[PDB]
Design a protein around this ligand. Structure first.
Ligand SMILES: [Zn+2]
Ligand SMILES: [Zn+2]
Lengths: 88, 46, 361, 49, 98, 178
């Protein structure tokens, strides 16, 4: 998961990545509109260096929502697990 | 500089900034919550 | 490129529901509408491996399928994640490509599976000893070592080193001293975390003081844990020997562990000579064990000062006056023959000829 | 092998655990003993209120 | 969990081979244990149900048995061989919450 | 540059073709130093004190010699064996002498942390104390293999000429030092 990329001109993140924290995951307390990105996930193309194609977790929703809390944890299989809670 | 996470049980501030496994620096607990954003947000009293 | 403008500013965008491709430069549509699967057919979804879909896994010989079955069972009895299993089977399927690997006896293949799981686990940095896996196999350690070397030089694949701290961190939990079981007196029970911290600092001292290079780490770690267990309660545990401690732990003790413990105690005495109080107290091999605390509190400065006095194999440290003496030049071969009576010296007479004939008749 | 083997080298641990948890989660209880199957024997607990 | 497992074990306590007879395997007693979690390096600690909810883990306890079998000699006994893990119902005899 | 310690060869290996058919039983019978046990292996072993070498005969007309301290000395040993075979009555000849292998060893008189050597050079240096305390190191220029130990002594093997061992030592010395 990569940090939010920033516009050279405004030196601020592009609109889609508005609410991401520096570590590439959304931030509790922010407000999220439709068609914005919650987790900037990308995965390699192996299916010489490995290219990465992007598969972000976008929010689809008819109405705004506020992020309540974001949980990080891992399983025994070393998988990262992210859970987010949204409020209306 | 690095991001801070709050341990789910003892609330001791931790830092990862790495591919390390999620574990509390102090205790054995294995759940972490992100801190509240630093920006302000504007609400309507309605 | 926009068919109407030629400019290449196409942006992917969607209206409330329609997904479409729009020339942002002029407001033109160039493509829209998508065909997708549904949830109704999602529940019917099957899967087929590309090997099954491309004509493989039918040629697997009875012995090859038995071998991969063995890989599965040996990896699973050790409670590894499925990632370890899949990497192991992938490695062995790749290894089976070699003609000299497939054409072989069964025990050599068994030890190849052993080293396959060893390399897969090393890749994921898990510490596992060669002894345990060797005992799990039905083969002796020598053939196992020979095939491990053979495969790593045949494949040239990366072999991560056996990191010390993680091996200590795995080994430490085997000590059943931390439970107040009826078999072991409660006097010997101790907190596990400080146990690990003391053992870790002793092992780090042994590592930086040259004791681990070229030598088996398990005896060094055993000595570290033993000096720790002694130093944490001198009043009673100073009277216990390694045989007693290993009997209490139900762990076998390597024979070289005693020599490693003696060497590490010698290192400890070399460290103790610097401290103001210890050097006046005139300590000894046994008494030093009750100051390991303050010896390790200030490790860095004392060890650096002591290094200005290094450690090396004692067999060579006996003050060798002559090191690798130059032998006399003896490359001369004469002209054609420096002697000829040697041939008469190296041939038998008819008597000895007949004697040899009758010696083994 | 002529020399004696031991079964403890084949205590396949996954078999029981998998057998249960997939049965509870999927709610299908196929049993060859009775040549019968029972479907829909478990449901996700509802937490509306 | 308390009795009927005992009867099921009792009904299948012995097994013997036709090929190479005089070898056999026989259970003696089975235990259900308390719920726990497999730590990444072969250890366990007590686990609460809520942690099982958050981490997608399964709330279960290890089933383990003592066993008797022959290898050359007939004197090989184990006491705590695990056979599997049993999911635990909340507030039952074994669950931490009770 | 050199530290004044020159690598010293401890073994040479060489072979030569005798050019004629031989009988192993006859050699074993007529020679004093010959050793022959057909039940174990179908070859005769030869031993002489000057040079200090060991060699073998084979019925197909082949000879191998090893144990010498120099390639010229190995050739001398091989020619002495050929002379012995000739005087035993076989029409042998000294045809196609070839040096096969020569081993050397040296020292640097300072400790070599094998941990550092592996973690800087894992691609061609293999380190595994448990089965072998020393570090195993292979090289391309020239095609040599080395054993590096804690005390700083090094064993060199695989060469055909002492120049290769010398230049190998010169190549590894700056690595050993740092
Ligand atoms: Zn904590
Ligand atoms: Zn256009």
């Amino acid at each position: 998961v990569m940090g939010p990329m920033l516009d050279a001109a405004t030196r601020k993140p592009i609109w889609r990545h508005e609410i991401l924290d520096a570590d590439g995951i959304c931030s509790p307390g922010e407000k999220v509109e439709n068609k914005q990105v919650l987790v900037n996930k990308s995965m390699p193309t192996v299916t010489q260096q490995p290219q990465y194609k992007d598969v972000p977790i976008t929010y689809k929703g008819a109405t705004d929502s506020y992020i309540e809390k974001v949980m990080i944890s891992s399983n025994a299989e070393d998988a990262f697990l992210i859970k987010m809670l949204l409020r209306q | 500089q690095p991001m801070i996470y709050i341990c789910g049980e003892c609330h001791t501030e931790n830092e990862i900034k790495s591919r390390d496994p999620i574990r509390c620096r102090e205790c054995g607990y294995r759940i972490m919550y992100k801190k509240r954003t630093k920006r302000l947000v504007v609400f309507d009293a309605r | 490129r926009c068919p109407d403008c030629g400019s290449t500013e196409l942006v992917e965008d969607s209206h409330y529901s329609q997904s479409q491709l729009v020339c942002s430069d002029c407001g033109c549509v160039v493509t829209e509408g998508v065909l997708t699967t549904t949830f109704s057919d999602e529940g019917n979804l099957r899967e087929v491996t590309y090997s099954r879909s491309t004509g493989e896994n039918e040629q697997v010989s009875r012995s090859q399928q038995r071998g991969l079955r063995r890989v599965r069972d040996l990896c699973r009895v050790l409670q590894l994640p499925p990632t370890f299993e899949d990497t192991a089977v992938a490695y062995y399927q790749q290894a089976y490509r070699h003609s000299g690997i497939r054409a072989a006896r069964l025990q050599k293949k068994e030890v190849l599976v052993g080293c396959c799981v060893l390399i897969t686990c090393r890749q994921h940095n898990w510490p596992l000893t060669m002894g345990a896996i060797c005992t799990l196999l039905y083969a002796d350690l020598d053939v196992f070592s020979s095939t491990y070397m053979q495969i790593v030089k045949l494949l040239g694949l990366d072999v991560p080193s056996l990191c010390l701290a993680e091996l200590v961190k795995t080994y430490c939990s085997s000590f059943k001293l931390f439970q107040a079981s009826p078999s072991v007196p409660a006097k010997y029970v101790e907190d596990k975390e400080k146990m690990l911290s003391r053992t870790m600092q002793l092992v780090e001292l042994a590592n930086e003081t040259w004791l681990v290079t070229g030598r088996h780490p398990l005896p060094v770690i055993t000595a570290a844990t033993f000096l720790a267990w002694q130093s944490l309660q001198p009043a009673d545990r100073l009277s216990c020997s390694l045989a007693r401690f290993c009997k209490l732990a139900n762990v076998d003790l390597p024979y070289p562990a005693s020599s490693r413990l003696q060497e590490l105690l010698a290192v400890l005495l070399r460290m103790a000579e610097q401290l103001a109080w210890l050097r006046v107290l005139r300590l000894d091999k046994r008494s030093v064990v009750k100051h390991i605390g303050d010896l390790l509190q200030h490790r860095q400065s004392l060890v650096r000062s002591a290094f200005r006095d290094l450690l090396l194999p004692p067999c060579m440290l006996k003050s060798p006056k002559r090191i690798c003496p130059v032998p006399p030049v003896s490359t001369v071969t004469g002209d054609e023959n420096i002697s000829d009576s040697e041939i008469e010296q190296y041939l038998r007479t008819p008597q000895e000829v007949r004697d040899f004939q009758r010696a083994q008749a | 092998r002529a020399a004696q083997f031991d079964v403890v080298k084949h205590m396949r641990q996954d078999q029981i655990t998998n057998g249960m948890v997939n049965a509870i989660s999927t709610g299908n209880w196929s049993l060859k003993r009775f040549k019968m199957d029972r479907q829909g024997v478990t449901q996700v607990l509802s937490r509306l209120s | 969990i308390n009795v009927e497992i005992k009867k099921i074990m009792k009904a299948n306590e012995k097994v013997t081979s036709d090929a190479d007879p005089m070898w056999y395997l026989k259970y003696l007693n089975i235990y259900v244990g308390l719920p726990d979690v497999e730590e990444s390096f072969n250890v366990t600690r007590p686990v609460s149900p809520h942690e099982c909810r958050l981490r997608d883990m399964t709330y279960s306890a290890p089933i383990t048995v003592d066993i008797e079998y022959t290898r050359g000699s007939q004197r090989i006994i184990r006491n705590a061989l695990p056979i599997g893990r049993m999911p635990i119902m909340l507030r039952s005899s074994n669950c931490v919450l009770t | 540059g050199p530290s004044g310690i020159v690598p010293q060869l401890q073994n040479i290996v060489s072979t030569v073709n005798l050019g004629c058919k031989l009988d192993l039983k006859t050699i074993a019978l007529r020679a004093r130093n010959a050793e022959y046990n057909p039940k174990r292996f179908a070859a005769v072993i030869m031993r002489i004190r000057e040079p200090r070498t060991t060699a073998l005969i084979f019925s197909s007309g082949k000879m191998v010699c090893t144990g010498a301290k120099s390639e010229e000395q190995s050739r001398l040993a091989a020619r002495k064996y050929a002379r012995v075979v000739q005087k035993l009555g076989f029409p042998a000849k000294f045809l196609d002498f070839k040096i096969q292998n020569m081993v050397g060893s040296c020292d640097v008189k300072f400790p070599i942390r094998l941990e550092g050597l592996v973690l800087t050079h894992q691609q061609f240096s293999s380190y595994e104390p448990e089965l072998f305390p020393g570090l195993i190191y292979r090289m391309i220029k020239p095609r040599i293999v080395l054993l590096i130990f804690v005390s700083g002594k090094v064993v060199l093997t695989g060469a055909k000429v002492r120049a290769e061992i010398y230049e190998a030592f010169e190549n590894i010395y700056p690595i050993l030092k740092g």
